[PDB]
Nucleic acid binder design. Structure first.
Ligand SMILES: [Mg+2]
Ligand SMILES: [Mg+2]
Ligand SMILES: [Mg+2]
Ligand SMILES: [Mg+2]
Ligand SMILES: [Mg+2]
Ligand SMILES: [Mg+2]
Ligand SMILES: [Mg+2]
Ligand SMILES: [Mg+2]
Ligand SMILES: [Mg+2]
Ligand SMILES: [Mg+2]
Ligand SMILES: [Mg+2]
Ligand SMILES: [Mg+2]
Ligand SMILES: [Mg+2]
Ligand SMILES: [Mg+2]
Ligand SMILES: [Mg+2]
Ligand SMILES: [Mg+2]
Ligand SMILES: [Mg+2]
Ligand SMILES: [Mg+2]
Ligand SMILES: [Mg+2]
Ligand SMILES: [Mg+2]
Ligand SMILES: [Mg+2]
Ligand SMILES: [Mg+2]
Ligand SMILES: [Mg+2]
Ligand SMILES: [Mg+2]
Ligand SMILES: [Mg+2]
Ligand SMILES: [Mg+2]
Ligand SMILES: [Mg+2]
Ligand SMILES: [Mg+2]
Ligand SMILES: [Mg+2]
Ligand SMILES: [Mg+2]
Ligand SMILES: [Mg+2]
Ligand SMILES: [Mg+2]
Ligand SMILES: [Mg+2]
Ligand SMILES: [Mg+2]
Ligand SMILES: [Mg+2]
Ligand SMILES: [Mg+2]
Ligand SMILES: [Mg+2]
Ligand SMILES: [Mg+2]
Ligand SMILES: [Mg+2]
Ligand SMILES: [Mg+2]
Ligand SMILES: [Mg+2]
Ligand SMILES: [Mg+2]
Ligand SMILES: [Mg+2]
Ligand SMILES: [Mg+2]
Ligand SMILES: [Mg+2]
Ligand SMILES: [Mg+2]
Ligand SMILES: [Mg+2]
Ligand SMILES: [Mg+2]
Ligand SMILES: [Mg+2]
Ligand SMILES: [Mg+2]
Ligand SMILES: [Mg+2]
Ligand SMILES: [Mg+2]
Ligand SMILES: [Mg+2]
Ligand SMILES: [Mg+2]
Ligand SMILES: [Mg+2]
Ligand SMILES: [Mg+2]
Ligand SMILES: [Mg+2]
Ligand SMILES: [Mg+2]
Ligand SMILES: [Mg+2]
Ligand SMILES: [Mg+2]
Ligand SMILES: [Mg+2]
Ligand SMILES: [Mg+2]
Ligand SMILES: [Mg+2]
Ligand SMILES: [Mg+2]
Ligand SMILES: [Mg+2]
Ligand SMILES: [Mg+2]
Ligand SMILES: [Mg+2]
Ligand SMILES: [Mg+2]
Ligand SMILES: [Mg+2]
Ligand SMILES: [Mg+2]
Ligand SMILES: [Mg+2]
Ligand SMILES: [Mg+2]
Ligand SMILES: [Mg+2]
Ligand SMILES: [Mg+2]
Ligand SMILES: [Mg+2]
Ligand SMILES: [Mg+2]
Ligand SMILES: [Mg+2]
Ligand SMILES: [Mg+2]
Ligand SMILES: [Mg+2]
Ligand SMILES: [Mg+2]
Ligand SMILES: [Mg+2]
Ligand SMILES: [Mg+2]
Ligand SMILES: [Mg+2]
Ligand SMILES: [Mg+2]
Ligand SMILES: [Mg+2]
Ligand SMILES: [Mg+2]
Ligand SMILES: [Mg+2]
Ligand SMILES: [Mg+2]
Ligand SMILES: [Mg+2]
Ligand SMILES: [Mg+2]
Ligand SMILES: [Mg+2]
Ligand SMILES: [Mg+2]
Ligand SMILES: [Mg+2]
Lengths: 46, 98
RNA sequence: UAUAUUAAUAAUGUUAUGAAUAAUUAUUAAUAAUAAUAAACUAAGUGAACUGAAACAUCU
RNA sequence: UCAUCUGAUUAAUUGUGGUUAGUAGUGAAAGACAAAUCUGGUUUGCAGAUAGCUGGUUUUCUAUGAAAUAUAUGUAAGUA
RNA sequence: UGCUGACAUGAGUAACGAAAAAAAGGUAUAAACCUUUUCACCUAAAACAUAAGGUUUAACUAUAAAAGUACGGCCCCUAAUUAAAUUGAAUAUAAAUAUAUUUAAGAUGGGAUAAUCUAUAUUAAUAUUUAUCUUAAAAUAUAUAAUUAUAUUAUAUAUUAUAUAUUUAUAUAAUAUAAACUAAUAAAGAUCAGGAAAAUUAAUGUAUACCGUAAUGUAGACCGACUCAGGUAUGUAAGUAGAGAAUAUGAAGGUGAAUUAGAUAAUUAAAGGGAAGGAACUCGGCAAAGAUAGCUCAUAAGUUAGUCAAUAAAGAGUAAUAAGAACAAAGUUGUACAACUGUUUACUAAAAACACCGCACUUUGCAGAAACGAUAAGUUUAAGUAUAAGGUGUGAACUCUGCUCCAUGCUUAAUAUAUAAAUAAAAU
RNA sequence: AUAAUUGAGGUCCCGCAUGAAUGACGUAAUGAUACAACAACUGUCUCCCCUUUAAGCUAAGUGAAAUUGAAAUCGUAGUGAAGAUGCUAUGUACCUUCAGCAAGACGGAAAGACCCUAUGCAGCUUUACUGUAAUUAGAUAGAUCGAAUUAUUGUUUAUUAUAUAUAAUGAUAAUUCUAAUCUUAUACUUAAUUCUUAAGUAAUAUAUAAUAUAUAUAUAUAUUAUAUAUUAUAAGAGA
RNA sequence: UAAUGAACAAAUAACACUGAUUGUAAAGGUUAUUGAUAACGAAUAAAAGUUACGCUAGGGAAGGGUAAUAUAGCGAAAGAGUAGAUAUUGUAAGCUAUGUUUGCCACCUUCGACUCAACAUUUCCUCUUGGUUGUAAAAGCUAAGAAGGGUUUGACUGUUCGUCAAUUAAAAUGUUACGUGAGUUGGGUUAAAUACGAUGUGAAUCAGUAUGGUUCCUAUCUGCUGAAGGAAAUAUUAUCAAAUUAAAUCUCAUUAUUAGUACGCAAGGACCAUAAUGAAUCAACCCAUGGUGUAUCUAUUGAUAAUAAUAUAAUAUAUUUAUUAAUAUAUUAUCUAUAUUAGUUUAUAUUUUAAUUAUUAUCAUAGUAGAU
RNA sequence: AUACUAAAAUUAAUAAUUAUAGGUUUUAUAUAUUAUUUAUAA
């Protein structure tokens, strides 16, 4: 069937699995949070 | 239908038809053949009708004379179940039926 | 409810039934807590493969 | 897309959440799917991996100017 | 087929993306915007309310109004599940971390009061899914307390007239269409045996928090590179007609499009009809054509006895005897493969391949086999116990499954038997 | 069976090269599976014709794409890195277009398709080579982590049999005991509100000594005294 | 003239050369000898296959040449031909031509069907002619000139081919990238799926079998089919126009007459020529016939909307009557509301004034049938 | 006649002659009722 519509939005899932606390509350999540910060990125997380 | 040509099960007219005692039955969780890692440790096991794991006595420590009131069918056991009622205390219980 | 709790006091209202008593207003003593905090350098543990050997396994 | 065709009370369809994935999951089993297609994804790093292979390598004038044979080679697209 | 920027050719060519429009006026500025009328399309939607999503795109900055009584979130409670959290020394592990117990979080779920409108706080004491069948009786029609047939099997609130505390409530008695449909107890059939968690009184008390609210939401307002014929959850979805949410019209609503105006050449696509033949076409009846009820009867051979065959083919009853909407409805047989319903190659293979119920072998006695665990604790197996669980092959059923363990394994018995590691002591 | 059949069905069997759970054979139903036959039906065909709508064409507005060494881009024969718009000879052709056709420009782009090379890559197989998880076995001739009894047998010493016994030292097998291991379940008072130490005594449990009673030196009960405890208890495996 | 093997690592003995603080030693060194790398200049002490599920970097590290083969001819004539090699036939050997089959070299990396065909003649039929003790006639055999016209429809198979059936005058042979996929189809052939037979220990494989299975293009240039504009015209315009150039056509069969004549014992049965019927192909036409005919008319099922007439009610303007009532005209409307136990629809009663006819219209494939 | 082109017909309204398309009239065709009937008067 037709494809391309893989991203079906949902604020709950988007925030729960890519949000700031979804990464600030884990070792691996924190590591990528600080890596983006060191690179100088404005938007640390979702 | 062709699916009924080999449907064959024993009929026991004496088996209970009502629901079991809620005070003993507890919910049976479905793991899907998956261990705490999430992987399927045991294969070929999957979803099915919802069930309640009955609590059947397998020790019978307390003892004393007891009378059976109804012989029921346990969805989680190949054997039947008997609801015992103590002749003095009146406590109820389930035991593997003979 | 830290503009907080307990205790004391002056008053009010005020139950209770002069005194008590809490509620309130206002004073004084005690009771309590705020982690974004760098990178590189150093040391320690585990530790590859591509590659070279014009192949490859000891070796690198 | 249209016509035609199949199931349509079930091993059915579907909404909202959750678990399982990179030697690695799910799989009524097709080497099917894991964010437009997996005999094993993507990103960063080792890393300018290696390439006896292909392509490219920029102004002028002057003098000399070949070979494609022999030997050896896991060697016949290479090299001495 | 070098990287970046600018500009050419294809070329003013293809295309402008399902479509009905017309006049008059705003406006001696309009095919494209607004209004009025006519016509048309969608109408169990292209309408009306919503959920999620989103550059607020809306009838807009002077903008989306909540104590609650059908208003949701918020808050209490938990499911699946998650957790740098808790437990001289919980257990395990090169670190990372994993496991078990607690605690906390987590809706897609549960949460008394209410138009005769209602009051949530503080203190003290003690329900899986599924049907409403048959008899009975009342009441009715033809017949004579007997018989045939017939709507009904239970509630939903108005009026009249009476009795109670006294024109507020209850009770009684009588009257009051049919077809759907709604929530509540009732009654009862099957195995596939059907969630978790958070009290009553007595007194006192309530000045009603925060957030959501526009419009689009079967789409120009979301996911699809696009104002993309694709994907997107829920409830009503006028009537007429029907068994029906099929099919035909359409009341009301919305709507008629970033392309227009002429002739419609050859040719292409989607449709309508076609004389005489009727498969001669073609790899192959691919495509197209073919329907004499849709209700009530009737319905063979074979057969695993199952109207399976079967919606049997032909046939009959109801006005039709020349026809006049749409939808449902498209024959018979032999053979090969597979028992059948199902699954499969998202995007060239849907099958004879996978699964299947059934048959057969084998491992495991639970302090177990099987699987996972840089590797263990431990987890699934299972809150199960040989009629159970794991693995293997075949694959419903009728008639059957003959022979041989040579080779690779498996399994039982034999010190028959070599060899590694580990050690003393003692000779050259 | 058809006018005629390499297709279909039945039958026969030198089965190149069937055969019984890699199941064998014959059925009923099922099948959008594959092949074949009959009836109807038809524009599939003889043989194509007419008609409608959206394009195609024209005018207005907007406006891509693959491709492109430069082009002033004809035919035939010959030649040629072997099939010429471009070389040689010769012929034809006034300049520019529009709607069509699709024979060539070895037409264009995805992407075709097969070979050979690389001391290239990846998956899969195995009695290819080399390791390894896993499983199995030994180390009182290693550790954690010790003993007793019984039975068979090996070798030897004093004593014997002949031209067979005792004893010592081991090994094998079984059985038993355990604080080896391992599994499973559940009061007062002083000294430093709660915690801790400490002399004394209360009560429970265990062990020893003495006294008294009752049965066949031994068993059972009671009292006195001394010592310890306030992780254990129960079950299982066990050197 | 062949009777062979490098280093490395080890082994044995001899020399007295070093001896890692010194003395020894250990160890190395020089000399002599030993064992095979046969892929024999020997990559390690130690290594086989499968891939159609495949991937990357590269090279090609039907046309063309040849003509053994194949087709055809020529020279000579052994032998058949009742007689006679040369009417017809023509062993084996010889000389050639073509590149239509099977091959060989490596310069160069899709069979069949549908549609349209163009070209050659090595002529299948039609036209003229020579030979034929084997031309009596008619049918025939062989050969020469001849390419103007023509050269099939079905069953089977994916087939070209081939067998068969029914016709014809005949159902010829080739070339054109074995013509024609930027023209169509795609049945065979091959890629992913699956199964059977055989091979293999298997993974998989087959000059095997069977079911299923993706291609696309808007034409710039050449060329071609049609249509225009500019132009240079033995120099204008309107009209008529010959030679010429390009191309189309060119036929074939049956019957009848000659004539049952010629020929022939008989059977059978003419040449030469003419006419009439047709076949195939092409061009033109719509008077008539069939088709179509979204021109049109009629019939008909369901639903909705509208115009006119009539009845009712209200408003407005004129007239009569007495702001009432009535006539004329115009406009507007045929609603609504309550009850029948909760909701919706309908039905009836209740309230109001809430009408019947006639003729249209739209939708259902042009709704559908019959005509035209 | 035709894709756009091109060809062909008319563009008369005057002292006289000229019809290109639409419309109108006549005749005819088609469709389908009609003699039980159409227009008129006496
Ligand atoms: Mg995307
Ligand atoms: Mg998730
Ligand atoms: Mg299993
Ligand atoms: Mg290397
Ligand atoms: Mg079915
Ligand atoms: Mg169905
Ligand atoms: Mg059911
Ligand atoms: Mg495969
Ligand atoms: Mg991707
Ligand atoms: Mg895949
Ligand atoms: Mg490196
Ligand atoms: Mg590189
Ligand atoms: Mg020189
Ligand atoms: Mg040279
Ligand atoms: Mg070599
Ligand atoms: Mg070389
Ligand atoms: Mg090379
Ligand atoms: Mg460049
Ligand atoms: Mg063009
Ligand atoms: Mg064009
Ligand atoms: Mg266009
Ligand atoms: Mg206007
Ligand atoms: Mg519908
Ligand atoms: Mg309706
Ligand atoms: Mg809406
Ligand atoms: Mg909670
Ligand atoms: Mg909720
Ligand atoms: Mg909203
Ligand atoms: Mg709203
Ligand atoms: Mg859309
Ligand atoms: Mg978007
Ligand atoms: Mg309407
Ligand atoms: Mg709308
Ligand atoms: Mg549009
Ligand atoms: Mg016809
Ligand atoms: Mg007919
Ligand atoms: Mg045929
Ligand atoms: Mg044919
Ligand atoms: Mg069909
Ligand atoms: Mg029968
Ligand atoms: Mg149908
Ligand atoms: Mg058979
Ligand atoms: Mg099947
Ligand atoms: Mg099926
Ligand atoms: Mg597919
Ligand atoms: Mg398919
Ligand atoms: Mg089973
Ligand atoms: Mg295990
Ligand atoms: Mg089993
Ligand atoms: Mg099988
Ligand atoms: Mg069976
Ligand atoms: Mg089978
Ligand atoms: Mg057998
Ligand atoms: Mg040893
Ligand atoms: Mg035959
Ligand atoms: Mg056939
Ligand atoms: Mg057969
Ligand atoms: Mg077998
Ligand atoms: Mg059958
Ligand atoms: Mg234009
Ligand atoms: Mg040439
Ligand atoms: Mg020249
Ligand atoms: Mg072309
Ligand atoms: Mg074209
Ligand atoms: Mg090489
Ligand atoms: Mg060596
Ligand atoms: Mg010396
Ligand atoms: Mg020394
Ligand atoms: Mg030495
Ligand atoms: Mg080797
Ligand atoms: Mg294959
Ligand atoms: Mg050639
Ligand atoms: Mg002779
Ligand atoms: Mg010869
Ligand atoms: Mg000739
Ligand atoms: Mg003759
Ligand atoms: Mg001539
Ligand atoms: Mg060809
Ligand atoms: Mg050919
Ligand atoms: Mg096989
Ligand atoms: Mg198919
Ligand atoms: Mg002329
Ligand atoms: Mg002539
Ligand atoms: Mg001709
Ligand atoms: Mg005609
Ligand atoms: Mg005519
Ligand atoms: Mg006619
Ligand atoms: Mg006609
Ligand atoms: Mg409509
Ligand atoms: Mg004039
Ligand atoms: Mg005229
Ligand atoms: Mg005139
Ligand atoms: Mg006219």
């Amino acid at each position: 069937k037709s494809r391309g519509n893989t991203y079906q939005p949902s604020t709950l899932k988007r925030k729960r699995t890519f949000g700031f606390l979804a990464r600030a509350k884990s070792k691996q999540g924190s590591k990528i949070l600080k890596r983006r910060k060191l690179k100088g990125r404005w938007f640390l997380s979702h | 239908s062709p699916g009924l040509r080999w449907y064959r099960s024993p009929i026991y007219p004496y088996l209970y038809k009502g629901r079991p005692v809620r005070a003993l039955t507890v919910v049976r969780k479905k793991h899907g053949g998956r261990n705490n890692s999430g992987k399927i440790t045991v294969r070929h096991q999957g979803g099915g009708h919802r069930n309640r794991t009955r609590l059947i006595d397998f020790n019978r420590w307390e003892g004393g004379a007891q009378t059976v009131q109804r012989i029921e069918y346990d969805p989680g056991r190949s054997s039947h179940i008997a609801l015992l009622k103590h002749n003095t205390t009146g406590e109820l219980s389930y035991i593997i039926a003979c």
